[PDB]
Amino acid sequence: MDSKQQCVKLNDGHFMPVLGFGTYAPPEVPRSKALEVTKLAIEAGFRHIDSAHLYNNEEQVGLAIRSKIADGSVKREDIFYTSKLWSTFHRPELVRPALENSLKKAQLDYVDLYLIHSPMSLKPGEIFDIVDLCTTWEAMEKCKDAGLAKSIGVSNFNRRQLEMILNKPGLKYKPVCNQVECHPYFNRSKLLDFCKSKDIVLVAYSALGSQRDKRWVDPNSPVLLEDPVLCALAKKHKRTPALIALRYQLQRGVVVLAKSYNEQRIRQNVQVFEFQLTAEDMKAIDGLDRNLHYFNSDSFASHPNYPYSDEY
Numbered sequence: 001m002d003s004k005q006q007c008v009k010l011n012d013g014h015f016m017p018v019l020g021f022g023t024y025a026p027p028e029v030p031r032s033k034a035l036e037v038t039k040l041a042i043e044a045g046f047r048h049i050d051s052a053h054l055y056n057n058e059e060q061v062g063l064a065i066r067s068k069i070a071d072g073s074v075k076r077e078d079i080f081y082t083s084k085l086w087s088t089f090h091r092p093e094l095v096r097p098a099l100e101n102s103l104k105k106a107q108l109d110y111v112d113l114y115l116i117h118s119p120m121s122l123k124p125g126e127i128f129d130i131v132d133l134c135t136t137w138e139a140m141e142k143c144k145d146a147g148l149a150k151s152i153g154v155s156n157f158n159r160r161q162l163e164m165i166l167n168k169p170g171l172k173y174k175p176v177c178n179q180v181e182c183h184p185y186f187n188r189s190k191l192l193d194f195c196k197s198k199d200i201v202l203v204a205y206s207a208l209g210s211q212r213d214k215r216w217v218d219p220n221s222p223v224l225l226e227d228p229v230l231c232a233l234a235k236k237h238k239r240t241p242a243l244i245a246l247r248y249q250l251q252r253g254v255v256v257l258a259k260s261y262n263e264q265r266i267r268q269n270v271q272v273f274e275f276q277l278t279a280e281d282m283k284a285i286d287g288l289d290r291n292l293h294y295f296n297s298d299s300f301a302s303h304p305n306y307p308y309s310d311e312y
């Protein structure tokens, strides 16, 4: 079996656990649930915890972390906590205060990772905004220099959006990661190759096929975990389709998130470290790639900085 504490070194010298706990739940789920399930996740062995301003759960997630520190289960340095800058805060003067507010919500001194949530800028408050993300990035760099974030990265960027940052004059810090939709139906092979070539970690969200939220996802879309190839592999290994989907990412060198608000499934998901897929299994999963991103709404596709038009 693998070690549950497996991590990879980021391009700034910090370390990221390769399995992360996804904390988003839709608004119909009471806010208090995030507290309970984040503690369960830590109990089960998750150390990388993924939150965001958008999730309206930072207080609950922060309290769970601090509760597990206070009772001696973990130390702060054992936890890798991520938050994200929401798209109405892209204007550079709004970036550091947004992080400060996230830190105060979680009652933490620092985040391990702060991401630009999305390249699709939205007007402060709110429609679409036009912001040079290089200016947003410079403000992110200042957050790292001040120690508010140990590491900084991006999310939902394509190759060209990454290149704009990487080629920026006077760049101080490369993004450590690009957190993107990634699963066997949309495996991001070319983007993965590019990220690897630049010492940028690809972090997979919706690795289990997304929460299929009606705001963002077509109910007609095939359900990832119902896929016959994933189910046949689950049968072969006497695992579950979810575990096959998570293991696939680990064997590609992708850091993988998994959201569950169910005690049994939270505990199940850490078993990703407990088996392997063969080369032939991995080939079978690669065959599933079909250019299906579950997040697929007019609200994204019509945006000037929508990442999905380019080849990768």
Ligand SMILES: NC(=O)c1ccc[n+]([C@@H]2O[C@H](COP(=O)([O-])OP(=O)(O)OC[C@H]3O[C@@H](n4cnc5c(N)ncnc54)[C@H](OP(=O)(O)O)[C@@H]3O)[C@@H](O)[C@H]2O)c1
Pocket (backbone or CB within 6 Å): 021, 022, 023, 024, 025, 050, 051, 117, 118, 155, 156, 179, 180, 204, 205, 206, 207, 208, 209, 210, 211, 225, 240, 242, 243, 257, 258, 259, 260, 261, 262, 265, 266, 268, 269
């Ligand atoms: N950067 C971004 O724009 C972005 C976008 C999407 C997500 N994310 C992050 O990534 C996290 C995960 O992605 P996601 O929210 O799309 O969900 P996901 O990890 O793809 O999970 C989808 C669903 O799978 C179910 N599940 C979990 N374990 C299972 C298992 N072992 N067997 C059968 N079903 C299982 C969960 O339902 P139950 O809760 O009922 O178990 C969950 O709702 C998010 O919570 C968030 O932290 C980021």
